[model samples]
Each structure stands twice: as structure tokens, then as C-alpha cells.
Target chain A: MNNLKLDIVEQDDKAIVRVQGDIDAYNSSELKEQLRNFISTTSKKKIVLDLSSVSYMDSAGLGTLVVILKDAKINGKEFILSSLKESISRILKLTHLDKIFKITDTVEEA
Target chain B: MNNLKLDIVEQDDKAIVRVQGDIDAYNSSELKEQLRNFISTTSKKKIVLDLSSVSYMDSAGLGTLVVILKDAKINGKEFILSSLKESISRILKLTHLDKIFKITDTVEEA
Candidate 1:
């Protein structure tokens, strides 16, 4: 089981954070840290999380997203998610968080 | 090995349908039939689905829910869901369908 990996790529006014591997209780903190750091340091206020390569996620992962959403709102940043696989997208829809998060079909759309 | 089972129980103004077994492309039609039949016959306009015992579901299952939601809306009925495990709930959240469906923490609440 590989821990989660976060790759921050800077685009014009957006930061595309590509996440890979499992996001569970054990490694969600790292994701939180990276997201927080990006929000504080980068000039890009818009963030898109790429989940196409993420193999698994659990409730802890959901919680992490919730925290990120809160942080973005407080800091006046826009957060979007894109490239989610079917399984992961289904989970987000079920929780109703998909409505709260701006989700695009592709990263380019974000 | 077991196919899906739908047991319809009527309350004063609600119908509780308990579903068991897997819901995939193979048995979604059967599940759809039961749900349709219940809607056609029951005087109760509120329907609550108990998914605690449902061990598995797929895209077909999600499709079934969409169909049910559409049917309920067209007929002016209230469709609710309850008792989803973490795995199923995560899927629902990912898809953002949780906002569309009236999901309760328990059947009693529904």
C-alpha cells in the first residue's frame, strides 16, 4: 500500500494537484498539509484536484476534502475537482458533497 | 448467489422497502419492477429504501436509483434512502446524488 502522493503543477491561474494512491486515515494529513500550503503560498486561488489516478479513498478522505473546502472558503479561494473515475465520482455524488464542490469533466475544463 | 429481494412494508403514510443482495446489471430490472409496482399500487407517497443489507451495487444500480428518482418525481412521490454503509455512502457522495435523494441516517427518521 503506497501512501498518497501529491504533485503540484502550476498553470496560468490554477494549481492542478494530481493525487495518486490510497487516501485513508493514515495519510490524509499529508494531503491536507499540501493543500493548505498551496492555498497560503501560491498566487493561484483556483485549485483543481485530479483524481484519475487515485486508486482508493475512504471516509477519512472525504473528511479531508471537507476540511479543504472549509479552508478555501475562509481564504476566498476556489476549489474544483476533475478527472475522477466512475467509482470515486459515485461516492462523491452519494455524499452530496459533489454539489458543494465544483467538479469538471476534465482538468482543462477546470 | 442470492438475487435481490424487495419487501414492501406499509406504514400510516409511508412505505419501507427493504432490499437485500447485489444490485448490478443482471438484477436491476427485477429491482426496478418491484419499485414500480410499489409506486403504482401503494397509496403512500413516501418511500424509504433500506440499503444496510445491500452488499453490492454498480453503475447499473446507480442508474436504477436515477430511474426511481425520475419516476417518483413524475408521479409526485417522495423517495428516500437510509442505512447505507460507508462504502455505499461514499459512492453516493462522490456522484453528488445524495443531494437529489432524501437520505436519512436511519429508517425511522425517514
Candidate 2:
């Protein structure tokens, strides 16, 4: 199984996860795992997901984001997104979940 | 017939199309016709689509945007967007169409 690759980088008080490859049903579990891990370890109240390199994402991927967002809220952490490719952005808009997340134009903005 | 409504507003050098109602297979034809007419009549070089009031849109609605973008390119006009509710923004991102159009923070920005 081709798993989603999440390279976590820390800056200041934020954790930036550089997501790569396709996020589909096959690897959504891995994504969930990483997100959960981040929540547990980070003291920074902000998390940035860099999706410029993510080429493909399905409904499953979107669902994973929603779940993560919910968890972030429960933990009182701010979840932010940046550098999403157009394809992924469209899915978020279609599902109406984009309204729930704080999306920024660039990582610096996040 | 419950067709998609395209409310046109002309400003100094731009045309804004306020699309209301759901866009689906049934009313896509009317949308296409209206877009065609807009392209033929406009001297402006920018088109802004305000989708804040659009409740839903399917693949057909997305295709309509693509058609308009192509026509805009052929006419050497700029295609801009603003006030897309979360659902609409998600769809645009998913399809990668957001890359082709310049999305603004608000109608005033467009």
C-alpha cells in the first residue's frame, strides 16, 4: 500500500506538515494517525498543513481533514491550511467544509 | 423552469455575474447561453462571478465555468471570482479550476 507521506517541520510554535503524494481511501488512515500524533505532541496552538505538493485527494481525504478539524477544536488548537493546489481546494469548496477551516494564501500567512 | 439566474452588474471596466440558485444538468444550457451573450457584448476585460448565493453546483456547473474561462481567454479578458461560499470553493478546488481563475477576498477586491 502506498501511504501518504507527512514530513513534519516545526517553526516557532507551529507544526507544518508537508503532505505529499495522493490521499485516498488507501492511505487516509495514515493521515489520521499523523494528525492525531501532532495533536498529542504539539504545544503550539497552531498547525499548518502545506498541500502544494499533494497532487490528488478524494472524498476520503476530505473527510480526514474534517475529522482533524473537529479534533483540533476539541483540543482548542487552531488548524490552518495553506498552499493547497486547485484540485484539493475545489473539493473542500464543493463539500462546504472550506468555510470551517482557516485557509491562507501562503505558509507565511498561516 | 427553475433556471440558474445570472444577474449582471457592469462597473467601470468589469462585469460581475451574480449567480443564484442551484446549477445542475437541467439549467446548465441557459447558463451557457447567457455566458455566450456576455462575451459577445462586453468591452470589459474582467469577469467576476459572485457565488455567495449559489447553494449547490454539480459537474455541469463546473463545466459552465470552464466554458466561460475558455471564452474569456479567447477574448483576452481576465476571469476573476469572489464571495464563493465554502461549498462552492471546495468544488472549485477539487476540480483544479481555482488555479485558472483569480479568486479575490471580496467583491470589492475583484
Instruction: For each of the candidates, give the backbone clash count.
Output: 21, 17
Q: What residue runs in model 1 are displaced by over 4 Å at the alpha carbon?
A: B1-110
Instruction: Give each prediction's root-mean-square deviation over alpha carbons.
Output: 9.9, 9.8
**Candidate 2 C-alpha lDDT tens digits along B45-107:** 888888778878764455456556666766788878789889878766654556556798787
Candidate 1 per-residue lDDT, tens place, A1-110, comes to: 24887888988889899998866656777888888888888888788899899766665566567657667766887889899998888776665557667899999898
Using lDDT as the measure, the top candidate is 1
Q: Write down the TM-score of every candidate.
A: 0.52, 0.49
Worst 10 residues of 1 chain A by lDDT: A55-64
DockQ of 1: 0.06
The chain B TM-scores of all candidates, as shown, are 0.92, 0.89
The CA lDDT of each predicted structure is 0.77, 0.75
Model 2 chain A: worst 10 consecutive residues (lDDT sum)? A58-67
Give the local distance difference test score of model 1: 0.77
Evaluate every candidate with DockQ and list the scores: 0.06, 0.03
Model 1 TM-score, all chains together: 0.52
